[PDB]
Amino acid sequence: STAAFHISSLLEKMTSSDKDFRFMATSDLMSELQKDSIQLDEDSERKVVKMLLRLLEDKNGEVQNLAVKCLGPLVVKVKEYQVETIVDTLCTNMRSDKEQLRDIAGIGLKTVLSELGLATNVCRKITGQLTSAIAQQEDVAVQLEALDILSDMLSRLGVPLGAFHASLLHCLLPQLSSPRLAVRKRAVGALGHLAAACSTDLFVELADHLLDRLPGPRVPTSPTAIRTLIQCLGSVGRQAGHRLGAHLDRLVPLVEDFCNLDDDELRESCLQAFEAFLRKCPKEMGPHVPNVTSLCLQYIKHDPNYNYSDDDDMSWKVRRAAAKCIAALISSRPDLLPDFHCTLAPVLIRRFKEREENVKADVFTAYIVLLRQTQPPKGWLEAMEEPTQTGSNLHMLRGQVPLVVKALQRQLKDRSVRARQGCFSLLTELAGVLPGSLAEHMPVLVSGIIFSLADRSSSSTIRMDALAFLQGLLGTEPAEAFHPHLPILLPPVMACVADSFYKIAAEALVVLQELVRALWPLHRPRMLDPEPYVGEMSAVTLARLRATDLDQEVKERAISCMGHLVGHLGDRLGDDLEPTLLLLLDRLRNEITRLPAIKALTLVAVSPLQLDLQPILAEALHILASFLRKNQRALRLATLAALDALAQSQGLSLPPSAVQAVLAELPALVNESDMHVAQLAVDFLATVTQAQPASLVEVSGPVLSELLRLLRSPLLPAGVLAAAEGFLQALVGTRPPCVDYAKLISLLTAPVYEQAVDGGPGLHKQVFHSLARCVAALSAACPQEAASTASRLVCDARSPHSSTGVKVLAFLSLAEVGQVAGPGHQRELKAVLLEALGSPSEDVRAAASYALGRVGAGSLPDFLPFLLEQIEAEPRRQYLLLHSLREALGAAQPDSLKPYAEDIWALLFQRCEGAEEGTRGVVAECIGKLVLVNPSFLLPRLRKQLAAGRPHTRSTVITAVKFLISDQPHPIDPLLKSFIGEFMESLQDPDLNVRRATLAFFNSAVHNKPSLVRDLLDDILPLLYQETKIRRDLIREVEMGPFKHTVDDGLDVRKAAFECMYSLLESCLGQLDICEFLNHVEDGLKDHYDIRMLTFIMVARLATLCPAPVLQRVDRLIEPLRATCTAKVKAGSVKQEFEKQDELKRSAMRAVAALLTIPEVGKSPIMADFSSQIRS
């Protein structure tokens, strides 16, 4: 009963008695009630609109803005049957002549449009009203606001007006000829906005209508007639130029002819239109690039009033337009960079002396665009390049630099701030593109910088820009070039440190730090004597650091600069060394300068000057140990780095009590929650163990326990394990009474020892790998502690009483001790290992194979002949033995295998003729890793074997060359890139195995290193598609009763080809033809189920990688998808076919939805009906 009498009670309040209270009454009527505050009796709502006619012109319209901010939700709370009525009455009162009701009507109609058969009808009524206002209502005040609302409504209502657009253009066409240009300009703007979504033929009609009225039949005409047409042409250019290529060929000569006419504004319009066309239509403007270019090269110089009345000149606008056109031409078409360097770059340079300001700024911007275009590709600025096309461009720029410097020399001392800022920016860009090129002109540039550092009257912007330019120059140019100018350059910078504006102080401090880090490098002998300056440097920095009422930024910069100064010149500070250090220590305690002080202390400790940090060791160590307890990752990392550096630098000159205090905190850090902190902590423990062992007596226990608990985890990276290895190296090498090895493996095997039943919850295979690898690496770390235990373990483990874990750990530890530090002699281990290789358990067999493989490499001249003899005499167990051989050649350096390598060759292909697939594959990797011994000499033998040999031989050869691919850069890359053609030409072999192996080779090459096959793709793609087509000769429908599934043997090659096709899609998209790509997609989509799924994935990816070809082809692409979805399978089918049909239906649905995400695909009947059927 809330919203029943509440509304009606307030209705009587609008009877002119509560005019002051009506404003609050409407605001109260709009409250938090917008859930179900609607009922019958629309008489109330028409009374509301009548009363909101009183929140209008009356009472001077004081409550109008608030009235409409309140009626917005009111006019959306009106319902459709009153929506039509309110739209009609808004139109009728727009017809009213009051110049006040029209504002409320327009803004209310805008609100209604924002909120929204009936909608279409009201939109048509609004459009008709607007058209009548524009055309029929021949008074300026109505046309102008009608155009305003029409433009602001097209800006967001492009699509709903598609039916009325054709008429709208008509009512906007004569408007380009009406007087009172205030309407003409907005008509041009509205027409340009309209010509953005006006179908596909309406734009053509507009273009070829506007073209007709433009020209004069070989006779001059008044510029006023054609000026508006050219302006409209430019507007439609900037808006939707990419639809005017067909008419460009006829528009361009006319625009040029009008540009030849004598009028400044006309020339402006023509040049702006040329800019729009050039930036929007690069391809269609090709045959017109030269002509327009000449025009620019003239009108950039156009200035008749100036020899080589300030309110009646506009030639500078012509020059600015010409410069902007040149910039657009340069940016649009990179292909013509060299030609510009011979025709555009010189002229532009000659215009660096432009008398104006905006013209000069645009010339500078054009040259900066040219410089950024000449930039060589990034990621390669680390070594010299061959004289390619980029080499020619860089040579042109290097020859250009002297002219740029000569032309810019005078401007650096100009009185204007803008010119100096432009010169600084341009020279910074030029230095960035060409490092080390401005050195020869240093006597000039430096002078300019000084002129901008002694400046006082102007703002601080010029000073800060000068300092930034100096910092960039220090970063780029070599240090030596600054030596002659140091006596003059150094004082002013220091004078900027003591400035009263803190930003300048911070910038000067940063520049000073860069200067001291660059002129006096750390690890090289000093070429310049630093005595004359260091005193003043130190005085200024200390004076700035000793004031505690300064800002935070200056404090941080001063701390960093003083840290760098001490670290690089600790010798020359002298009497200021002892106080300065203490200052840093103080800054180490505040909560706002913890991190800069820590970094400065780290840098001071690292420096090779061998400073005397004795006074602050105890305090710094205690403070850092206190910091270790806090739970912040960045602070912890900084503290560990500082502690490690300090310990390494100090060595044997540090107090023991502080060492114990800091060591009492470390065991809490060694945990699996974070790994980087654990690695740093272990490194610090190793360092302090090497330095001062006596402090480790009382901390060995918990540290060892936490280290073992960390090693329990299966997520140890190699760095943590190496750090632990080094820790144990030091802990045993120190020969302390606390811990001296012989406890790691024991503790690690303690749960393994209790595993008396080999049927419980064992580790995962990868968990086995990680844990056993860590344990064996620890065992093999120290060889001196384990010298006798290496032989002891074989004796105590050869007995088959221990569990499988102890056994596998024994073989892995033996392999690791033979690998890490010298091959374990163990002359009697060969027989035991051979006996145990035939273990019943597969894990023990793999461990034995790994052990043999890793022990053979270390003792190849003795065991390799024995292994080959065993292979020759006994071929029964060739699988594990071949894995061992593979591991042996993997772990043996090629330089030690060259004399005997050929012999292994004579063996490996001897076993290549077998019928076992696994042995063939293993021999393939063996050959692949044997080629790594010498690629140049061993490659031709494999090439000739592939050219002439048994298919079982060339298949293994091509598998080996496939395995020869390495993700990292490898020395065979040039040879492989040169020789890949012969290998890739193997698909003509009718044998299935060779073709499949070559397809796998291609897939691996594309996935890992696309550069190997990229240059050859054009000679690969066609023949590759030959494998895509289905071959029916291999398809044999064997007679298995009435019904049988065909056993197609050519499916694997098709699958491999499709995998290669996907890899090319993901990596080599730039060298593919989309038409044949989609044709092969269509051909394969009807193939086997796996091909169907992969093709569906390809279609899903192409729906985002090429919307236009997919949109074109979808009209026929849907039919296979529709047939796939609508196929009906009998309920008598067993679960495989049900699951397969469900999966294919879901995949096809996903593909259909991915296609539907494209808006254009959504505007066709076939998939709309398909979606309707799916919903139904």
Partner: protein, 725 residues
């Protein structure tokens, strides 16, 4: 029906079926014949003694499967999958045909099936698959799962493998998940596939990606890690879409997003800030795309972006320094540059997200008002004022008229700045003043641009911000029409001596006030009286706006050898007209006669002396270093020689400039008083009586569209109104 002997027929079809398990070598004939013989007759045979027959079939299949297991455990260790596939397809086809033919004898009897699950015939329709699960699947499941996981990890590293083996084995896994709940339920049960392969695969995936991401981030920058993660996510969705069941898909995605993205969020946050310090937009787009997947993971990004925008704007406005307080151009241009850059970034990299747009608006609405310039101006009402002055400098006549398109763009930028300033009534007041002073002196560069500006203001705020301005425009038009009509009347009567322009301004619109007393020279007396008589004959009921310090014009001097035209204000006109008789006047007499205040007269005196139109007692005395006392004598410079015929001397005064600054202070205080009283006491009356706390809270959102009231001000207004509530 017949009851033929059991053993003979049993051995017959046993031999037939053990031949059929082998690959077909004969033709279709006996395949029809034997199975038709079974179907037509042995329905009763396969029903009751069919229990014994099916037990014998089960033990035969048991020995067959044991033989297969014994022959399929020789070496393997990877070749397990090829054997398992080939055998699975072969046995699947054999069991499918056998179950299609032989089970028809006992099936279709759902009535018997319901009772106790049809005795021992329960779920024996797929007893071939049951035997596959028990006899052979159980011993080899661990080996095949380990081989599959090894192959997947091998493919993850970069190598290429034959996915058909994995696809076949996972299809086999999901196939044996028979739906025992209902034999006619449309939908598979994935119990065995989930319990034997899915959990292990998911755990392996999470472990591998944890290790790989940690190792990568330990020795690489964040950008490369984001690049790698973006590819890895789609790679691991493609794997499932290709050779894995669909039920895993969604779950797998979650796990990846919980390892590659979420667990590193902290690092990402820090990196985000660093990116904002270098303006690497593509990396920001990548980071936004990555973090979009994590639910409620974008909030910290919004907070960081807002804080960064605020700090950047504050620093950029502070860097200008002291020159901002007197140069509107640099202040507004700095604001516009910051806003344009960060709006472009938000629109391009962050895909125009609503939350990021709100963050930009909140950041920009907090450094327009409270920044360094207003802080050193001691009042937050300096941000609007300067803006207004900027608009003035965009519309006064200048040497270089800006481009029309450039002018429209600049006005639109001024609007997008004005959208943020809290105090808008100050802007309206200052704009009205500047517009009036421009209209009176006719300094408008173009009427079209000025009307467009008024239209923009009307759309922005409403009809109140433009009613007064439209009134001013109509008044100036009416004055022009009246001047033309009086010119017509003059042409129809005695003409005037000199051509002067007069404008009649209604007192109820223009902000001008009369604050000085003047004495009319005899030259303008006849025009004055004639115009007063004419206007009295024309209009009545209002008061004439007669002001003289705003009246300027041109004068011609006959006291120089070369005829020069001097354009000057009315005070300078009176000063020069007083010299028509005597060229030497004392300052005290000039003050007594011309009724000009000492400061204004003194300033006019320095302006005249600097122009060299007049001389002091000592012609060589420096004007700046000589004070003008009331007894100072000024003489006419009769021998004035100059290159330019037209001379302007009516220049605004520096002392008048500081007086105008004082008038701006008075304008600000007038705004304060009018605002407070005549805009809060009225609304307090409107709201009537309430609890006095939520009333205070809610009155702030009824006047908020044009200022923000302060709580002590509203309390003072309530205290004042407590006399009448």
């Amino acid at each position: 029906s017949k009851q033929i002997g059991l053993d003979q027929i049993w051995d017959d079809l046993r031999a037939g079926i053990q031949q059929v398990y082998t690959r077909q070598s004969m033709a279709k004939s006996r395949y029809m014949e034997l199975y038709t013989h079974v179907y037509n007759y042995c329905t009763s045979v396969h029903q009751f003694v069919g229990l014994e027959l099916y037990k014998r079939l089960k033990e035969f299949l048991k020995n067959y499967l044991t033989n297969l297991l014994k022959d399929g455990e020789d070496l393997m260790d990877e070749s397990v999958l090829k054997f398992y596939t080939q055998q699975w397809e072969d046995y699947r086809f054999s069991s499918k045909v056998l179950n299609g033919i032989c089970a028809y004898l006992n099936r279709h009897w759902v009535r018997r099936e319901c009772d106790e699950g049809r005795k021992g015939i329960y779920e024996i329709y797929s007893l071939a698959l049951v035997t596959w699960r028990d006899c052979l699947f159980r011993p080899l499941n661990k080996q095949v799962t380990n081989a599959v996981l090894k192959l997947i990890e091998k493919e993850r590293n970069g190598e290429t493998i034959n996915t058909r083996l994995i696809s076949g084995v996972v299809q086999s896994y999901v196939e044996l998940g028979l739906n025992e709940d209902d034999a006619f339920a449309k939908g598979p049960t994935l119990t065995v596939y989930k319990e034997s392969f899915e959990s292990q695969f998911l755990a392996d995936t999470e472990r591998f990606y944890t290790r790989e991401s940690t190792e990568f981030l330990q020795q690489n920058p964040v950008t490369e890690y984001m690049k790698k993660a973006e590819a890895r996510l789609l790679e691991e969705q493609r794997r499932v879409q290709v050779y894995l069941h669909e039920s895993t898909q969604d779950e797998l995605a979650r796990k990846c997003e919980q390892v590659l993205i979420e667990k590193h969020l902290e690092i990402f946050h820090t990196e985000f800030q660093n990116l904002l310090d270098a303006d690497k937009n593509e990396d920001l787009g990548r980071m936004y795309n990555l973090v979009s997947r994590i639910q409620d993971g974008l909030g910290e990004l919004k907070k960081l972006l807002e804080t960064h925008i605020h700090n950047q704007g504050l620093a950029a406005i502070e860097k200008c320094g002291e020159a901002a307080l007197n140069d509107p151009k640099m202040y507004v241009q700095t604001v516009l540059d910051v806003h344009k850059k960060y709006n472009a970034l938000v629109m391009s990299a962050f895909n125009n997200d609503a939350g990021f747009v709100a963050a930009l608006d909140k950041a920009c609405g907090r450094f327009i008002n409270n920044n360094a310039v207003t802080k050193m101006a001691q009042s937050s009402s300096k941000s609007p004022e300067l803006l207004a002055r900027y608009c003035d400098s965009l519309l006064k006549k200048s040497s270089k008229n800006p481009e029309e398109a450039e002018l429209e763009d600049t006005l639109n930028q001024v609007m997008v700045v004005f959208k943020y300033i809290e105090d808008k009534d100050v802007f309206q007041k200052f704009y009205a003043k500047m517009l009036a002073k421009r209209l009176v002196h006719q300094n408008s560069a173009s009427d079209d641009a000025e009307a467009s500006m008024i239209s923009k203001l009307k759309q922005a705020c409403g009809f109140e911000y433009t009613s007064k301005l439209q009134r001013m425009f109509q008044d100036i038009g009416v004055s022009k029409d009246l001047n033309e009509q009086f010119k017509k009347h003059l042409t129809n009567s005695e003409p005037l001596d000199l051509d002067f322009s007069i404008q009649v301004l209604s007192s109820g619109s223009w902000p001008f006030q009369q604050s000085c007393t003047f004495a009319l020279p005899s030259e303008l007396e006849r025009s004055y009286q004639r115009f007063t008589a004419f206007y009295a004959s024309r209009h009545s009921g209002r008061k004439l706006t007669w002001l003289y310090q705003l009246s300027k014009g041109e004068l011609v001097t006959n006291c120089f050898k070369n005829r020069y035209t001097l354009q000057a204000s009315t005070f300078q006109m009176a000063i020069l007209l007083q010299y028509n008789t005597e060229d030497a006047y004392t300052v005290q007499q000039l003050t007594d006669s011309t009724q000009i205040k000492m400061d204004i007269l003194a300033q006019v005196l320095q302006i005249l002396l600097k122009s060299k139109l007049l001389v002091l007692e000592d012609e060589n005395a420096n004007v700046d270093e000589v004070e003008l006392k009331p007894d100072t004598l000024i003489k006419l410079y009769l021998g004035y020689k100059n290159k330019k015929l037209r001379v302007n001397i009516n220049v605004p005064m520096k002392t008048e400039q500081k007086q105008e600054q004082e008038t701006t202070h008075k304008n600000i205080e007038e705004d304060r008083k009018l605002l407070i009283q005549a805009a809060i006491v009225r609304i307090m009356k409107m709201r009537k009586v309430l609890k006095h706390q939520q009333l205070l809270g809610e009155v702030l959102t009824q006047l908020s569209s044009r200022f923000k009231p302060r709580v002590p001000v509203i309390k003072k207004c309530i205290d004042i109104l407590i006399e009448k509530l």
